[PDB]
A paper describes a structure:
Containing a tandem array of 2–30 repeats, pentatricopeptide repeat (PPR) proteins constitute one of the largest protein families in land plants. Each PPR repeat aligns to a single nucleotide of the RNA target in modular patterns, making these proteins suitable for the development of exciting new biotechnologies. Within each repeat, the combinations of two amino acids, known as the PPR code at two key positions (the 5th and the 35th) confer RNA specificity. A typical RNA-bound [name] protein adopts a right-handed superhelical spiral structure, with its target ssRNA molecule sitting in the interior cavity and interacting with corresponding PPR repeats in a modular fashion.
Because the four structures exhibited almost identical features except for the RNA base binding details of repeats 5 and 6, we focused on describing the structure of RNA-bound [name]-[name]. The N3 atom of uracil is a hydrogen bond donor, whereas the N3 atom of cytosine is a hydrogen bond acceptor.
Residue numbers in the entry: 36 to 410
Amino acid sequence: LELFAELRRQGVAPTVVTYNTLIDGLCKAGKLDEALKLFEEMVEKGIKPDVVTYNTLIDGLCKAGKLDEALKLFEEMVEKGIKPDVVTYNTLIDGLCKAGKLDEALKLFEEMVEKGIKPDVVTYNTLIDGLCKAGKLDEALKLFEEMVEKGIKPDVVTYNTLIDGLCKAGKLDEALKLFEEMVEKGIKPSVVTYNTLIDGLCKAGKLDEALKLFEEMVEKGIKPSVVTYNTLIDGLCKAGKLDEALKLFEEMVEKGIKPDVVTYNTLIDGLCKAGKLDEALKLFEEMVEKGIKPDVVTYNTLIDGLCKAGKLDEALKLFEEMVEKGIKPDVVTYNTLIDGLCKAGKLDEALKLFEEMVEKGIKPDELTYRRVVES
RNA sequence: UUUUCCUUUU
Protein backbone atom coordinates (compact mmCIF):
# COMPACT_ATOMS: atom_id res chain seq x y z
CA LEU A 1 0.00 0.00 0.00
CA GLU A 2 2.01 2.94 1.15
CA LEU A 3 4.73 0.61 1.82
CA PHE A 4 4.49 -0.14 -1.90
CA ALA A 5 4.96 3.39 -2.87
CA GLU A 6 7.99 3.60 -0.58
CA LEU A 7 9.49 0.51 -2.15
CA ARG A 8 8.95 1.94 -5.62
CA ARG A 9 10.71 5.23 -4.60
CA GLN A 10 13.87 3.26 -3.71
CA GLY A 11 14.14 2.31 -7.41
CA VAL A 12 13.13 -1.33 -6.72
CA ALA A 13 11.13 -2.76 -9.64
CA PRO A 14 8.65 -5.21 -8.11
CA THR A 15 7.52 -8.55 -9.63
CA VAL A 16 4.14 -8.84 -11.32
CA VAL A 17 3.23 -11.24 -8.48
CA THR A 18 3.66 -8.23 -6.16
CA TYR A 19 1.29 -6.09 -8.27
CA ASN A 20 -1.28 -8.98 -8.44
CA THR A 21 -1.46 -9.51 -4.67
CA LEU A 22 -2.13 -5.77 -4.36
CA ILE A 23 -4.85 -5.70 -7.03
CA ASP A 24 -6.35 -8.74 -5.28
CA GLY A 25 -6.39 -6.95 -1.86
CA LEU A 26 -8.10 -3.90 -3.40
CA CYS A 27 -10.78 -6.06 -5.06
CA LYS A 28 -11.64 -7.94 -1.82
CA ALA A 29 -11.90 -4.58 0.06
CA GLY A 30 -14.53 -3.21 -2.30
CA LYS A 31 -11.96 -0.81 -3.73
CA LEU A 32 -12.39 -2.06 -7.28
CA ASP A 33 -11.77 1.30 -9.04
CA GLU A 34 -8.44 1.56 -7.29
CA ALA A 35 -7.70 -1.99 -8.55
CA LEU A 36 -8.38 -1.07 -12.15
CA LYS A 37 -6.28 2.07 -11.67
CA LEU A 38 -3.28 0.07 -10.49
CA PHE A 39 -3.99 -2.25 -13.48
CA GLU A 40 -3.74 0.76 -15.84
CA GLU A 41 -0.63 1.98 -14.05
CA MET A 42 1.29 -1.29 -14.36
CA VAL A 43 0.57 -1.17 -18.07
CA GLU A 44 1.75 2.44 -18.34
CA LYS A 45 4.98 1.39 -16.57
CA GLY A 46 5.51 -1.35 -19.14
CA ILE A 47 4.86 -4.08 -16.59
CA LYS A 48 2.84 -6.75 -18.37
CA PRO A 49 -0.28 -8.06 -16.59
CA ASP A 50 -0.27 -11.86 -16.72
CA VAL A 51 -3.02 -14.49 -16.60
CA VAL A 52 -3.26 -14.14 -12.80
CA THR A 53 -3.63 -10.36 -13.19
CA TYR A 54 -6.63 -10.93 -15.46
CA ASN A 55 -8.14 -13.75 -13.33
CA THR A 56 -8.01 -11.51 -10.27
CA LEU A 57 -9.86 -8.64 -12.00
CA ILE A 58 -12.39 -10.90 -13.68
CA ASP A 59 -13.37 -12.32 -10.20
CA GLY A 60 -13.59 -8.89 -8.49
CA LEU A 61 -15.78 -7.50 -11.29
CA CYS A 62 -18.01 -10.61 -11.10
CA LYS A 63 -18.22 -10.22 -7.27
CA ALA A 64 -19.01 -6.47 -7.76
CA GLY A 65 -21.93 -7.47 -10.06
CA LYS A 66 -20.09 -6.39 -13.24
CA LEU A 67 -20.19 -9.57 -15.27
CA ASP A 68 -20.27 -7.64 -18.58
CA GLU A 69 -17.06 -5.82 -17.76
CA ALA A 70 -15.40 -9.11 -16.66
CA LEU A 71 -16.52 -10.55 -19.92
CA LYS A 72 -14.85 -7.73 -21.80
CA LEU A 73 -11.70 -8.30 -19.78
CA PHE A 74 -11.78 -12.02 -20.76
CA GLU A 75 -12.05 -10.97 -24.48
CA GLU A 76 -9.20 -8.64 -23.98
CA MET A 77 -6.79 -11.27 -22.60
CA VAL A 78 -7.63 -13.60 -25.46
CA GLU A 79 -6.96 -10.78 -28.00
CA LYS A 80 -3.59 -10.12 -26.30
CA GLY A 81 -2.54 -13.81 -26.55
CA ILE A 82 -2.82 -14.26 -22.79
CA LYS A 83 -4.48 -17.72 -22.61
CA PRO A 84 -7.41 -18.24 -20.26
CA ASP A 85 -6.50 -21.06 -17.93
CA VAL A 86 -8.50 -23.42 -15.72
CA VAL A 87 -8.92 -20.67 -13.11
CA THR A 88 -10.16 -18.19 -15.74
CA TYR A 89 -12.88 -20.65 -16.80
CA ASN A 90 -13.79 -21.65 -13.16
CA THR A 91 -14.08 -17.99 -12.24
CA LEU A 92 -16.37 -17.09 -15.12
CA ILE A 93 -18.41 -20.23 -14.70
CA ASP A 94 -18.98 -19.20 -11.04
CA GLY A 95 -19.94 -15.64 -12.01
CA LEU A 96 -22.39 -16.97 -14.59
CA CYS A 97 -24.07 -19.35 -12.16
CA LYS A 98 -24.40 -16.60 -9.44
CA ALA A 99 -25.94 -14.32 -12.11
CA GLY A 100 -28.70 -16.75 -13.24
CA LYS A 101 -26.88 -17.74 -16.40
CA LEU A 102 -26.43 -21.43 -15.81
CA ASP A 103 -26.80 -22.11 -19.55
CA GLU A 104 -23.85 -19.94 -20.39
CA ALA A 105 -21.80 -21.43 -17.62
CA LEU A 106 -22.27 -24.84 -19.09
CA LYS A 107 -21.20 -23.51 -22.48
CA LEU A 108 -17.93 -22.32 -20.93
CA PHE A 109 -17.58 -25.80 -19.39
CA GLU A 110 -17.67 -27.22 -22.96
CA GLU A 111 -15.38 -24.47 -24.27
CA MET A 112 -12.56 -25.15 -21.78
CA VAL A 113 -12.46 -28.87 -22.75
CA GLU A 114 -12.12 -27.74 -26.43
CA LYS A 115 -9.01 -25.78 -25.51
CA GLY A 116 -7.31 -28.84 -23.93
CA ILE A 117 -8.10 -27.63 -20.41
CA LYS A 118 -9.16 -30.31 -17.87
CA PRO A 119 -12.07 -29.45 -15.60
CA ASP A 120 -10.84 -29.93 -12.01
CA VAL A 121 -12.42 -30.30 -8.52
CA VAL A 122 -13.25 -26.50 -8.37
CA THR A 123 -14.84 -26.75 -11.88
CA TYR A 124 -17.03 -29.57 -10.67
CA ASN A 125 -17.77 -28.05 -7.21
CA THR A 126 -18.89 -24.79 -8.90
CA LEU A 127 -21.23 -26.52 -11.40
CA ILE A 128 -22.56 -28.92 -8.72
CA ASP A 129 -23.37 -25.79 -6.60
CA GLY A 130 -24.81 -23.91 -9.59
CA LEU A 131 -27.01 -26.91 -10.58
CA CYS A 132 -28.28 -27.51 -6.97
CA LYS A 133 -29.23 -23.82 -6.68
CA ALA A 134 -31.08 -24.05 -9.97
CA GLY A 135 -33.35 -26.91 -8.80
CA LYS A 136 -31.20 -29.48 -10.52
CA LEU A 137 -30.03 -31.87 -7.92
CA ASP A 138 -30.19 -34.85 -10.32
CA GLU A 139 -27.78 -33.29 -12.85
CA ALA A 140 -25.62 -32.27 -9.83
CA LEU A 141 -25.50 -35.82 -8.65
CA LYS A 142 -24.68 -36.93 -12.24
CA LEU A 143 -21.80 -34.40 -12.23
CA PHE A 144 -20.72 -35.98 -8.93
CA GLU A 145 -20.53 -39.42 -10.57
CA GLU A 146 -18.70 -37.94 -13.61
CA MET A 147 -15.89 -36.37 -11.52
CA VAL A 148 -15.19 -39.79 -9.93
CA GLU A 149 -14.88 -41.08 -13.57
CA LYS A 150 -12.34 -38.35 -14.59
CA GLY A 151 -10.28 -39.38 -11.58
CA ILE A 152 -11.17 -36.24 -9.60
CA LYS A 153 -11.60 -36.89 -5.90
CA PRO A 154 -14.69 -35.33 -4.23
CA ASP A 155 -13.34 -33.20 -1.38
CA VAL A 156 -14.85 -31.45 1.72
CA VAL A 157 -16.42 -28.60 -0.44
CA THR A 158 -17.86 -31.31 -2.81
CA TYR A 159 -19.49 -33.13 0.12
CA ASN A 160 -20.56 -29.77 1.72
CA THR A 161 -22.04 -28.56 -1.52
CA LEU A 162 -23.95 -31.78 -2.10
CA ILE A 163 -25.26 -31.97 1.45
CA ASP A 164 -26.50 -28.39 1.04
CA GLY A 165 -28.19 -29.43 -2.20
CA LEU A 166 -29.85 -32.48 -0.55
CA CYS A 167 -31.03 -30.53 2.58
CA LYS A 168 -32.65 -27.84 0.46
CA ALA A 169 -34.37 -30.65 -1.44
CA GLY A 170 -35.90 -32.43 1.59
CA LYS A 171 -33.29 -35.16 1.44
CA LEU A 172 -32.20 -34.58 4.97
CA ASP A 173 -31.52 -38.21 5.89
CA GLU A 174 -29.73 -38.65 2.56
CA ALA A 175 -27.47 -35.64 3.43
CA LEU A 176 -26.77 -37.44 6.69
CA LYS A 177 -25.60 -40.63 4.83
CA LEU A 178 -23.27 -38.41 2.79
CA PHE A 179 -22.04 -36.93 6.06
CA GLU A 180 -21.14 -40.46 7.29
CA GLU A 181 -19.83 -41.35 3.80
CA MET A 182 -17.26 -38.48 3.96
CA VAL A 183 -15.98 -39.58 7.41
CA GLU A 184 -15.78 -43.11 6.01
CA LYS A 185 -13.47 -41.63 3.36
CA GLY A 186 -11.29 -39.60 5.70
CA ILE A 187 -12.68 -36.23 4.76
CA LYS A 188 -13.06 -34.35 7.98
CA PRO A 189 -16.34 -32.29 8.38
CA SER A 190 -15.80 -28.59 9.03
CA VAL A 191 -18.03 -26.05 10.74
CA VAL A 192 -19.62 -25.54 7.22
CA THR A 193 -20.75 -29.21 7.18
CA TYR A 194 -22.44 -28.85 10.58
CA ASN A 195 -23.92 -25.40 9.81
CA THR A 196 -25.40 -26.75 6.55
CA LEU A 197 -27.01 -29.70 8.32
CA ILE A 198 -28.20 -27.48 11.23
CA ASP A 199 -29.93 -25.20 8.66
CA GLY A 200 -31.63 -28.16 6.91
CA LEU A 201 -32.87 -29.50 10.26
CA CYS A 202 -34.36 -26.06 11.13
CA LYS A 203 -36.14 -25.57 7.76
CA ALA A 204 -37.67 -29.03 8.04
CA GLY A 205 -39.09 -28.07 11.55
CA LYS A 206 -36.53 -30.23 13.48
CA LEU A 207 -35.07 -27.48 15.67
CA ASP A 208 -34.70 -30.08 18.43
CA GLU A 209 -32.31 -32.14 16.31
CA ALA A 210 -30.58 -28.97 14.96
CA LEU A 211 -29.62 -27.99 18.55
CA LYS A 212 -28.53 -31.51 19.34
CA LEU A 213 -26.16 -31.39 16.33
CA PHE A 214 -24.89 -28.03 17.53
CA GLU A 215 -23.97 -29.69 20.91
CA GLU A 216 -22.21 -32.67 19.25
CA MET A 217 -20.23 -30.27 17.01
CA VAL A 218 -18.83 -28.37 19.97
CA GLU A 219 -18.13 -31.79 21.51
CA LYS A 220 -16.23 -33.10 18.44
CA GLY A 221 -13.96 -30.06 18.88
CA ILE A 222 -15.56 -27.81 16.24
CA LYS A 223 -15.85 -24.18 17.31
CA PRO A 224 -19.12 -22.55 16.06
CA SER A 225 -18.84 -19.56 13.76
CA VAL A 226 -21.01 -16.53 13.39
CA VAL A 227 -22.98 -18.51 10.72
CA THR A 228 -23.65 -21.25 13.24
CA TYR A 229 -25.24 -18.65 15.52
CA ASN A 230 -27.04 -16.82 12.73
CA THR A 231 -28.62 -20.07 11.55
CA LEU A 232 -29.79 -20.98 15.05
CA ILE A 233 -30.99 -17.39 15.71
CA ASP A 234 -33.02 -17.54 12.45
CA GLY A 235 -34.48 -20.91 13.21
CA LEU A 236 -35.52 -19.83 16.71
CA CYS A 237 -37.15 -16.63 15.29
CA LYS A 238 -38.99 -18.63 12.52
CA ALA A 239 -40.16 -21.01 15.26
CA GLY A 240 -41.71 -18.22 17.40
CA LYS A 241 -39.00 -18.40 20.13
CA LEU A 242 -37.68 -14.91 19.78
CA ASP A 243 -36.75 -14.70 23.48
CA GLU A 244 -34.43 -17.75 23.01
CA ALA A 245 -33.07 -16.14 19.81
CA LEU A 246 -32.08 -13.07 21.92
CA LYS A 247 -30.47 -15.37 24.50
CA LEU A 248 -28.29 -16.92 21.77
CA PHE A 249 -27.40 -13.42 20.54
CA GLU A 250 -26.16 -12.66 24.10
CA GLU A 251 -24.40 -16.03 24.31
CA MET A 252 -22.34 -15.76 21.10
CA VAL A 253 -20.69 -12.60 22.46
CA GLU A 254 -19.86 -14.38 25.76
CA LYS A 255 -18.18 -17.08 23.64
CA GLY A 256 -16.14 -14.61 21.57
CA ILE A 257 -18.17 -14.74 18.36
CA LYS A 258 -18.64 -11.26 16.96
CA PRO A 259 -22.18 -10.49 15.69
CA ASP A 260 -22.29 -9.11 12.20
CA VAL A 261 -24.76 -7.57 9.76
CA VAL A 262 -26.53 -10.88 9.11
CA THR A 263 -26.89 -11.36 12.86
CA TYR A 264 -28.66 -7.99 13.06
CA ASN A 265 -30.73 -8.46 9.83
CA THR A 266 -32.01 -11.78 11.26
CA LEU A 267 -33.01 -10.48 14.66
CA ILE A 268 -34.47 -7.39 12.99
CA ASP A 269 -36.51 -9.68 10.69
CA GLY A 270 -37.90 -11.84 13.52
CA LEU A 271 -38.79 -8.75 15.63
CA CYS A 272 -40.53 -7.23 12.60
CA LYS A 273 -42.59 -10.41 11.89
CA ALA A 274 -43.55 -10.58 15.56
CA GLY A 275 -44.88 -7.00 15.26
CA LYS A 276 -42.19 -5.70 17.71
CA LEU A 277 -41.28 -2.83 15.39
CA ASP A 278 -40.22 -0.94 18.38
CA GLU A 279 -37.32 -3.21 19.12
CA ALA A 280 -36.43 -3.80 15.50
CA LEU A 281 -35.76 -0.07 14.90
CA LYS A 282 -33.73 0.19 18.08
CA LEU A 283 -31.65 -2.84 17.15
CA PHE A 284 -31.07 -1.03 13.83
CA GLU A 285 -29.73 2.00 15.75
CA GLU A 286 -27.56 -0.29 17.85
CA MET A 287 -25.76 -1.76 14.75
CA VAL A 288 -24.77 1.68 13.33
CA GLU A 289 -23.35 2.75 16.70
CA LYS A 290 -21.38 -0.51 17.01
CA GLY A 291 -19.95 0.22 13.52
CA ILE A 292 -21.74 -2.54 11.58
CA LYS A 293 -23.03 -0.79 8.49
CA PRO A 294 -26.65 -1.76 7.49
CA ASP A 295 -26.74 -3.18 3.96
CA VAL A 296 -29.62 -3.40 1.49
CA VAL A 297 -31.16 -6.47 3.31
CA THR A 298 -31.34 -4.35 6.56
CA TYR A 299 -33.40 -1.64 4.84
CA ASN A 300 -35.50 -4.18 2.90
CA THR A 301 -36.31 -6.04 6.10
CA LEU A 302 -37.36 -2.85 7.99
CA ILE A 303 -39.24 -1.55 4.96
CA ASP A 304 -41.10 -4.87 4.78
CA GLY A 305 -42.03 -4.76 8.49
CA LEU A 306 -43.33 -1.17 8.15
CA CYS A 307 -45.36 -1.82 4.94
CA LYS A 308 -47.10 -4.86 6.44
CA ALA A 309 -47.96 -2.79 9.48
CA GLY A 310 -49.51 -0.06 7.15
CA LYS A 311 -46.80 2.48 8.26
CA LEU A 312 -46.12 3.52 4.67
CA ASP A 313 -44.69 7.00 5.58
CA GLU A 314 -42.19 5.42 7.89
CA ALA A 315 -41.32 2.83 5.25
CA LEU A 316 -40.83 5.47 2.57
CA LYS A 317 -38.63 7.42 5.02
CA LEU A 318 -36.26 4.48 5.33
CA PHE A 319 -36.24 4.06 1.54
CA GLU A 320 -35.26 7.78 1.19
CA GLU A 321 -32.59 7.45 3.87
CA MET A 322 -31.21 4.28 2.23
CA VAL A 323 -31.08 6.01 -1.22
CA GLU A 324 -29.39 8.97 0.58
CA LYS A 325 -26.68 6.94 2.32
CA GLY A 326 -25.47 5.36 -0.96
CA ILE A 327 -27.14 2.02 -0.30
CA LYS A 328 -28.58 0.96 -3.63
CA PRO A 329 -32.18 -0.46 -3.75
CA ASP A 330 -32.73 -3.74 -5.64
CA VAL A 331 -35.61 -5.77 -7.04
CA VAL A 332 -36.65 -6.88 -3.50
CA THR A 333 -36.82 -3.21 -2.30
CA TYR A 334 -39.27 -2.22 -5.02
CA ASN A 335 -41.27 -5.40 -4.93
CA THR A 336 -41.70 -4.72 -1.20
CA LEU A 337 -42.94 -1.15 -1.67
CA ILE A 338 -45.19 -1.97 -4.62
CA ASP A 339 -46.56 -4.94 -2.67
CA GLY A 340 -47.11 -2.56 0.29
CA LEU A 341 -48.86 0.02 -1.89
CA CYS A 342 -51.02 -2.46 -3.79
CA LYS A 343 -52.07 -3.97 -0.46
CA ALA A 344 -53.18 -0.55 0.79
CA GLY A 345 -55.06 0.14 -2.53
CA LYS A 346 -52.58 2.90 -3.42
CA LEU A 347 -52.29 1.67 -6.98
CA ASP A 348 -50.94 4.78 -8.69
CA GLU A 349 -48.25 5.30 -6.05
CA ALA A 350 -47.21 1.72 -6.80
CA LEU A 351 -47.36 2.22 -10.57
CA LYS A 352 -45.15 5.32 -10.21
CA LEU A 353 -42.66 3.25 -8.17
CA PHE A 354 -42.74 0.60 -10.87
CA GLU A 355 -41.58 3.20 -13.46
CA GLU A 356 -38.86 4.57 -11.23
CA MET A 357 -37.45 1.04 -10.73
CA VAL A 358 -37.05 0.67 -14.54
CA GLU A 359 -35.55 4.18 -14.56
CA LYS A 360 -32.71 2.80 -12.39
CA GLY A 361 -32.14 -0.23 -14.64
CA ILE A 362 -33.26 -2.70 -11.95
CA LYS A 363 -34.86 -5.74 -13.62
CA PRO A 364 -38.45 -6.55 -12.55
CA ASP A 365 -39.76 -10.11 -12.10
CA GLU A 366 -43.07 -11.97 -12.22
CA LEU A 367 -43.49 -10.82 -8.61
CA THR A 368 -43.50 -7.22 -9.76
CA TYR A 369 -46.13 -8.12 -12.47
CA ARG A 370 -48.05 -10.66 -10.32
CA ARG A 371 -48.73 -8.00 -7.69
CA VAL A 372 -51.98 -6.27 -8.68
CA VAL A 373 -54.99 -5.57 -6.50
CA GLU A 374 -56.59 -4.91 -9.93
CA SER A 375 -58.31 -8.32 -9.91
C1' U B 1 -0.40 -14.05 -6.27
C1' U B 2 -6.06 -15.39 -8.63
C1' U B 3 -11.34 -19.35 -8.86
C1' U B 4 -15.65 -23.41 -5.72
C1' C B 5 -19.28 -24.98 0.11
C1' C B 6 -23.12 -22.94 4.96
C1' U B 7 -26.94 -18.16 7.64
C1' U B 8 -30.64 -12.93 6.84
C1' U B 9 -34.97 -9.46 3.40
C1' U B 10 -40.11 -9.21 -1.21
